Amino acid sequence: GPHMATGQDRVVALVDMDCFFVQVEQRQNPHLRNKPCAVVQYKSWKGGGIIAVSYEARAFGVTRSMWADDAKKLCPDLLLAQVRESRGKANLTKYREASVEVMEIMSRFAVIERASIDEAYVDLTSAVQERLQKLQGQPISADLLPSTYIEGLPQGVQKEGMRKQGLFQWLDSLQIDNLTSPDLQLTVGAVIVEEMRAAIERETGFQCSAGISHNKVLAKLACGLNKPNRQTLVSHGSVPQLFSQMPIRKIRSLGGKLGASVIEILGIEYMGELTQFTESQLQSHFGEKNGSWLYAMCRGIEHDPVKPRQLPKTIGCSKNFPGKTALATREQVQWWLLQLAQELEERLTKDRNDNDRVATQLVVSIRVQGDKRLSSLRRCCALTRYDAHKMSHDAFTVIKNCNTSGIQTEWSPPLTMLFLCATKFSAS
DNA sequence: ATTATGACGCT
DNA sequence: AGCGTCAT
Numbered sequence: 001g002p003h004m005a006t007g008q009d010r011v012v013a014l015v016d017m018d019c020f021f022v023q024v025e026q027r028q029n030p031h032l033r034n035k036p037c038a039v040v041q042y043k044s045w046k047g048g049g050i051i052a053v054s055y056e057a058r059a060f061g062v063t064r065s066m067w068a069d070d071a072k073k074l075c076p077d078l079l080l081a082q083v084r085e086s087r088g089k090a091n092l093t094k095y096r097e098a099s100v101e102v103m104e105i106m107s108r109f110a111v112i113e114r115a116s117i118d119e120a121y122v123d124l125t126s127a128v129q130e131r132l133q134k135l136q137g138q139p140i141s142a143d144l145l146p147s148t149y150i151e152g153l154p155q156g157v158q159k160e161g162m163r164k165q166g167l168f169q170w171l172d173s174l175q176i177d178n179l180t181s182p183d184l185q186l187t188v189g190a191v192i193v194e195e196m197r198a199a200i201e202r203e204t205g206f207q208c209s210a211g212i213s214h215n216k217v218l219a220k221l222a223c224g225l226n227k228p229n230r231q232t233l234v235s236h237g238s239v240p241q242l243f244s245q246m247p248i249r250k251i252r253s254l255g256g257k258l259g260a261s262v263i264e265i266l267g268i269e270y271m272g273e274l275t276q277f278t279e280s281q282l283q284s285h286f287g288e289k290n291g292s293w294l295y296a297m298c299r300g301i302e303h304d305p306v307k308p309r310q311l312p313k314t315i316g317c318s319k320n321f322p323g324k325t326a327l328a329t330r331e332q333v334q335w336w337l338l339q340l341a342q343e344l345e346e347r348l349t350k351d352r353n354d355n356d357r358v359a360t361q362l363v364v365s366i367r368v369q370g371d372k373r374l375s376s377l378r379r380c381c382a383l384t385r386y387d388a389h390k391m392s393h394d395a396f397t398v399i400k401n402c403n404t405s406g407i408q409t410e411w412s413p414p415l416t417m418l419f420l421c422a423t424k425f426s427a428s
Numbered sequence: 429a430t431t432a433t434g435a436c437g438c439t
Numbered sequence: 440a441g442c443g444t445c446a447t
């Protein structure tokens with residue numbers, strides 16, 4: 001009763017740019033706006049690989065991880081923008097720089113955790129307290145929540161009108177003189193996220209979706225419920241119904257092998273079905289940490305903090321060499337290591353100037369032809385100078401003895417991936 | 429030939 | 440440290 005934690009202590013949002021690389025290209029090229037459009041990497045093999053898709057194009061069945069030639073079969077009028085190529089490889093600088101535009105705006109409102117190039121968690125607990133104090137017990141108008149969905153409502157015929165019906169039910173029910181009502185806190189959080197999203201669109205042109213809830217996992221889940229250009233409030237009370245038909249794989253961290261094992265071992269399908277196991281039962285199958293996490297998570301409770309981190313922890317450069325393009329000679333391997341290192345040096349030097357830090361470790365990863373995993377080998381060495389020729393030489397030295405070829409020049413088995421990653425930053 | 433990233437966990 | 444998982 002009065003002692004069972006309910007995980008309602010925080011207000012957390014997750015902001016996710018809509019089809020982000022596509023929006024970056026549509027801002028730059030107005031001809032692409034409001035069209036079925038996708039962003040592609042490379043071009044020669046099957047038209048290039050699609051890595052982002054506008055919502056107009058998704059309606060035709062275009063997806064990421066699709067060849068452009070195949071997407072054109074589904075959507076003959078599909079427009080394409082190509083990722084920049086520099087030094088023989090895809091170069092994502094435009095999108096990283098657009099990301100910084102958005103992250104810096106979000107940071108004006110609250111502390112953020114950079115989750116990916118186009119998504120950030122927002123810790124709104126303090127901002128909500130402040131806005132509540134300023135509101136002086138004034139009711140919250142629907143006008144302040146023009147793009148908000150309240151998950152689970154309406155309960156007990158435009159699409160927009162059902163949004164409004166649900167919002168009206170929620171607001172009509174809200175108790176406002178309790179400054180500590182979790183539902184009220186979430187609602188004020190949603191007001192702030194409307195403001196944040198309006199600022200992002202005003203100041204960058206970019207639209208986004210967002211989730212507002214009491215923790216990162218629910219905020220992430222919420223964000224995906226109403227896309228694009230909308231935000232969703234998932235209250236603590238909404239969790240039992242929401243989870244009752246929610247496939248386990250939809251919850252962040254459960255979309256892979258662990259989630260599959262939860263399903264197989266327990267013989268369940270939906271997140272809510274987890275509530276029938278004891279904490280010790282779940283720990284016995286999935287380990288102490290996962291078991292405790294699952295026990296709380298299936299009740300809507302998670303404690304992972306929004307980490308105060310706006311900048312990436314690593315700066316990396318990688319290229320696959322699939323099929324016949326696999327690197328089979330010394331000079332080929334060296335040359336591509338150099339290309340990678342030159343991009344790495346450029347990005348590192350900019351990072352040092354912008355962010356007052358220096359990387360101290362270089363991680364070198366490769367894949368050999370006919371190998372199991374993403375990485376066949378991972379080796380680290382010191383990163384003492386931002387110099388591409390040096391880093392490339394060092395990376396070679398580190399991967400030297402992978403070459404089983406007794407022949408001097410030849411490289412066997414051929415390399416299907418090269419990866420340089422700068423890590424272990426220190427203030428400078 | 430489902431590419432180029434990036435964070436975090438395990439031992 | 441090096442490898443594996445999960446995700447964008």
Ligand SMILES: Nc1ncnc2c1ncn2[C@H]1C[C@H](O)[C@@H](CO[P@](O)(=S)OP(=O)(O)OP(=O)(O)O)O1
Pocket residue numbers: 016017018019020021022051052053064117118119227228431432447
């Ligand atoms: N698998 C993969 N490879 C390369 N680039 C990716 C990949 N996934 C995402 N991205 C890039 C391209 C995206 O514009 C960007 C954001 O990823 P996400 O959020 S999953 O998808 P978006 O393109 O923003 O559409 P969406 O969020 O509106 O569903 O990261």
Ligand SMILES: [Ca+2]
Pocket residue numbers: 016017018019020118
């Ligand atoms: Ca996105």
Ligand SMILES: [Mg+2]
Pocket residue numbers: 016119
């Ligand atoms: Mg996304």
Ligand SMILES: [Mg+2]
Pocket residue numbers: 016017116118119447
């Ligand atoms: Mg995203």
